[PDB]
Amino acid sequence: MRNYCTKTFGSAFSVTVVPTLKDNFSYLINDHTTHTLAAVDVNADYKPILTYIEEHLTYTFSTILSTHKHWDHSGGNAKLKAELEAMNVPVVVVGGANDSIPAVTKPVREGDRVQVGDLSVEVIDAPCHTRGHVLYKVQHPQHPNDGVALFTGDTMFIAGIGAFFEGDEKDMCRAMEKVYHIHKGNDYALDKVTFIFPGHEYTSGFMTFSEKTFPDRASDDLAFIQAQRAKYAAAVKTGDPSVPSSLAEEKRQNLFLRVADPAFVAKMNQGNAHALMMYLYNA
């Protein structure tokens, strides 16, 4: 009952949301300018990626990117790569250097970039959920205003964050600060065209959390959270993914991300940012 959907960035590229396993998302990046394809977070249930390519889409399927080592995000790397070299390739497997990701051929660290066709894929270190978790920031260098796809794995969900399996609240605060300030260089102009593609369909539960926990009942952010919650629920009701949200939206509806805003930390009145993250996590 879970549907695909496609978010498109101008004429430059698109990202297809591919529901996999029970509540996972894998993604297919498609560079329109070179017809180059890349897959993100390929697990044991990878055939739906292939099914999508052979209904909807000569193309070059060059890259697999894994946000983190967990099997529901890396368990299809070796198998899809094999497929893939047999039908074409050279297939590059990108993963965080410190996560020892299955089948990785391009270990990456903060600031690294890899190309997918003409698209740039910039790497952000976000250790917490796993010690080597990364985020992938994807855009077209020649079409920067067409927007950005941000693959956040299990670090950040819509209105949520991942469990701290291999780290702590300080790690998560640091990750939220990195995400919050991605576009500081352009005075956050690109926030509204930066789209968040996370690891799982956990939106419902987190949006209920945001609605209950938002501290300021006089703000229209509450009305916004309520409207967004209903919108995501309706999507999920028809089988549509709740994802993506924009970074502009997350800055309103995601209380964990808002820990990166000193004014919000003050408003919550639960101590400093670390204390606040702990409160929200616990909570």
**CB-nearer residue toward Zn ion: 72 or 125:** 72
Nearest to 156 by CA among 18, 259, 264: 259
Residues 103-142 close enough to bind Zn ion by CB under 5 A? none
Examine the residue annotation and report whether 35 is marked as an active-site residue of this protein: no
Count of residues interacting with Zn ion (CB under 5 A): 4
Kind of pairing, strands 134-139 and 119-125? antiparallel
200 is in an annotated binding site: yes
Look at residues 140, 148, 121, 123 and name the one whose alpha carbon lies nearest to residue 31: 140
Structure tokens belonging to residue 52: 């999508």
Among 72, 125, 171, 250, binds Zn ion (CB under 5 A): 72
Which member of 73, 125, 140, 191 is catalytic? 73
For residue 7, the one-letter residue type is K
> Can you tell me the distance from the alpha carbon of 69 to that of 154, in angstroms, rounded to the nearest whole number?
11
* Annotated binding residue 73: yes
Q: Which of residues 172-201 bind Zn ion (CB under 5 A)?
A: 199
**What is the chain's length?**
283
Choice between 117 and 162, CB closer to Zn ion: 162
Tell me whether residue 68 is annotated as binding: yes
Q: Catalytic one among 70, 125, 140, 191?
A: 70
Active-site residue identified among 32, 133, 140, 200:
200
70 assigned binding-site residue: yes
How many angstroms separate the CA atoms of 12 and 36, rounded? 11
Between 23 and 216, CB nearer to Zn ion:
23
Instruction: Please give the residues from 199 up to 218 whose contact with Zn ion meets the rule CB under 5 A.
Output: 199
Cα–Cα distance between 272 and 283 in angstroms, integer? 16
| Number of other residues whose CB lies within 10 A of the CB of residue 174 | 16
Q: What amino acid is encoded at 9 in this protein?
A: F
Q: Which of 31, 32, 41, 68 is catalytic?
A: 68
Residue 274 is assigned to a ligand binding site:
no
CA 198/CA 78 separation, integer angstroms: 22
Breaks (C-N over 2.5 A) in the chain follow: 57, 88
Torsion angles phi and psi, residue 136, rounded to 5: -115, 125
Instruction: Based on the residue annotation, tell me whether 72 is a catalytic residue of this protein.
Output: yes
Q: How far apart (Å, rounded) are the C-alpha atoms in residues 166 and 132? A: 9
Using the contact rule CB under 5 A, the part of the chain among 45-53, 148-156, 179-187, 246-254 near Zn ion is 148-156
249 in contact with Zn ion (CB under 5 A):
no
Binder of Zn ion out of 154, 169, 201, 250 (CB under 5 A): 154
Which span (3-11, 71-79, 240-248, 275-283) binds Zn ion, by CB under 5 A? 71-79
The structure tokens 């297939």 sit at 91
Binding-site residues for Zn(2+), please? 68, 70, 72-73, 129, 154, 200
Binding site for Zn ion (CB under 5 A): 70, 72, 154, 199
Binding site feature residues? 68, 70, 72-73, 129, 154, 200
Residues with a catalytic annotation lie at 68, 70, 72-73, 129, 154, 200
